[PDB]
């Protein structure tokens, strides 16, 4: 897990030897793994590249971070408001700093991860201090231009 780098944000043009060919300049990528879905039978955008040394994986994570690969925000990492279609290049501290401009955050946010890879699932949950920050996130942040990924902010629970 230390020598392997988890890549997120892969489109349909990216393939299993294509990621190994793109990561060959960063370091000696020994193997590439792409988990296939059960309903569609294709990649879900997240994969893994197992290299030989941890320094090559660190250089690939520091070089290929927030890159625009196949029209997709590909990024390598070390393997009541709901935000969907978020970029995997952002972290919890980056999401807390991005959410601090609209309103005040009550605590540190959390992002959902896949049970197989564990880098990024695609959705996240963040809680605001009051309902005014949630309304400002649903008015402004729900549709704002993020890092090559159109996010969507919505209410997790609402009572009619």
């Amino acid at each position: 897990q230390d020598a392997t780098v988890y890549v997120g944000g892969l489109d349909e043009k990216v393939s299993e030897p294509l990621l190994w060919e793109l990561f060959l300049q960063a370091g000696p990528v020994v193997n590439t793994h792409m988990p296939k879905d059960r309903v569609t039978g294709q990649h879900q955008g997240y994969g893994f590249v197992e290299f030989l040394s941890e320094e090559d994986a660190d250089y690939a994570i520091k070089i290929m971070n927030m890159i625009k690969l196949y029209g997709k925000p590909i990024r390598v990492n070390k393997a009541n408001i709901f935000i969907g279609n978020l970029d995997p290049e952002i972290d919890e501290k980056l999401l807390y700093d991005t959410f601090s401009a609209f309103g005040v955050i009550l605590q540190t946010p959390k992002i959902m991860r896949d049970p197989d890879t564990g880098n990024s699932k695609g959705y996240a949950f963040i809680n605001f201090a009051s309902f005014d920050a949630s309304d400002a996130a649903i008015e402004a942040m729900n549709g704002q231009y993020l890092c090559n990924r159109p996010i969507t902010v919505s209410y997790a629970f609402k009572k009619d």
Binding site: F102, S130, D132, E139
Partner: peptide
């Protein structure tokens, strides 16, 4: 976008004179 329409950011309501301001 030339300003911000947030309530707690750039708005004020003086209840002593009942004056509402927004910038």
């Amino acid at each position: 976008e030339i300003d911000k329409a947030e309530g707690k950011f750039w708005t004020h309501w003086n209840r002593e004179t009942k004056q509402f301001f927004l910038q």
